[PDB]
Design a protein around this ligand. Structure first.
Ligand SMILES: C[S@@+](CC[C@H](N)C(=O)[O-])C[C@H]1O[C@@H](n2cnc3c(N)ncnc32)[C@H](O)[C@@H]1O
Length: 327
């Protein structure tokens, strides 16, 4: 993550829904905001969340009563995508019933807040011929909110990894805000080689394979692209080797293969996976964020997580718009 010297959010209060590892929390707390709530049911996530943020989030959202949630200015949420079974006249609020989204709407209609800050998968914009996005959109509009959405790729913001994700920002219509804008992309000057740990701490991740077939040889120059160097097995997912002088492929929580979630990399004449500190680093997490003792957990977590840096630029630009109220 990077440091923000202009705390455009001091004094503002927020809730961290579907917490996971606490990305949105790391991000907003650096802009000055304060955390008033958190919710997350996966006992392992709650375990890491507590190791860093000292507290344990509450449980199953489906069961928390709306009128029970603290007063807040910003609602943060990276919920899980699910299809909507639209069975009726046109689209809106009533169709979000049965999904965990309805739980967001349920809390927004009855408690504050100035802005709803969400995030999801790269293809949220296309799911069901656009139907999935059409619903969340019409729902926010009909509760008196404005809707802005965009797909930003993390390599365009100082992080070496291919990872497109839709970011969605909603401003209460009461605020009258025609002033918002998503950050501008820039030059990348950090690649996978700069994020690795020394060999001594990564020996146990080397995988020796005789069916390794090299298609290209190591490039001499770094590029902001994904460079496939070789293969193993059938060359399907999880069995492809990448160059450290490039960008990391998209980390995944539930993938399989020989090099399962991190992908495999040619580091120093040996083929290995990424270590969890590396995974953290590839997501933007600071070296001070204590990770889960179980390396198979760290993987599932960091792959369902958030790119901190991107969250920090978008949040700053939110303090801005809310702080510009001239006579
Ligand atoms: C309250 S239960 C889901 C109940 C759902 N109504 C039902 O029909 O099955 C809470 C859900 O939150 C999901 N969840 C927790 N943290 C999340 C996050 N950061 N992003 C996405 N989904 C998350 C859990 O995996 C679980 O499915």
């Amino acid at each position: 993550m990077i440091e923000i010297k202009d705390k455009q959010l001091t004094g503002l209060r927020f809730i961290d829904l579907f917490a996971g590892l606490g990305g949105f929390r790391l991000a907003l707390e650096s802009c000055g905001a304060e955390c008033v709530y958190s919710n997350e049911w996966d006992k392992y996530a709650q375990e890491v969340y507590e190791m860093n943020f000292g507290e344990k989030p509450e449980g199953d959202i489906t069961q928390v009563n709306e009128k029970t949630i603290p007063d807040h200015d910003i609602l943060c949420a990276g919920f899980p995508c699910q299809a909507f079974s639209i069975s009726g006249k046109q689209k809106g609020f009533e169709d979000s019933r049965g999904t965990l989204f309805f739980d967001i709407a349920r809390i927004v209609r009855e408690k504050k807040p100035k802005v709803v800050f969400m995030e999801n998968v790269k293809n949220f914009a296309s799911h069901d011929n656009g139907n999935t996005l059409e619903v969340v959109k019409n729902t926010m509009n009909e509760l008196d909110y404005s809707f802005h959405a965009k797909v930003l790729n993390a390599l365009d913001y100082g992080i070496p990894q291919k990872r497109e994700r839709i970011y969605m920002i909603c401003f209460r219509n009461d605020l009258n805000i025609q002033n918002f804008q998503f950050p501008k992309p820039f030059e990348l000057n950090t690649f996978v080689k700069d994020l690795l740990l020394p060999d001594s701490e990564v020996e146990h991740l080397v995988i020796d394979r005789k069916d390794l077939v090299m298609t290209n040889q190591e490039i001499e120059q770094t590029t902001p692209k994904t460079v496939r160097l070789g293969i193993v097995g059938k060359g399907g997912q999880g069995e492809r080797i990448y160059s450290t002088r490039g960008i990391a492929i998209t980390l995944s929580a539930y993938g399989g293969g020989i090099f399962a979630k991190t992908g495999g990399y040619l580091v120093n004449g040996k083929t290995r996976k990424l270590h969890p500190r590396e995974c953290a680093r590839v997501m933007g997490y600071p070296d001070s964020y204590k990770v889960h003792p179980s390396t198979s957990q760290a993987y599932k977590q960091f792959g369902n997580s958030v790119v901190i840096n991107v969250l920090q630029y978008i949040a700053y630009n939110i303090g801005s718009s809310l702080n510009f109220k001239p006579y």
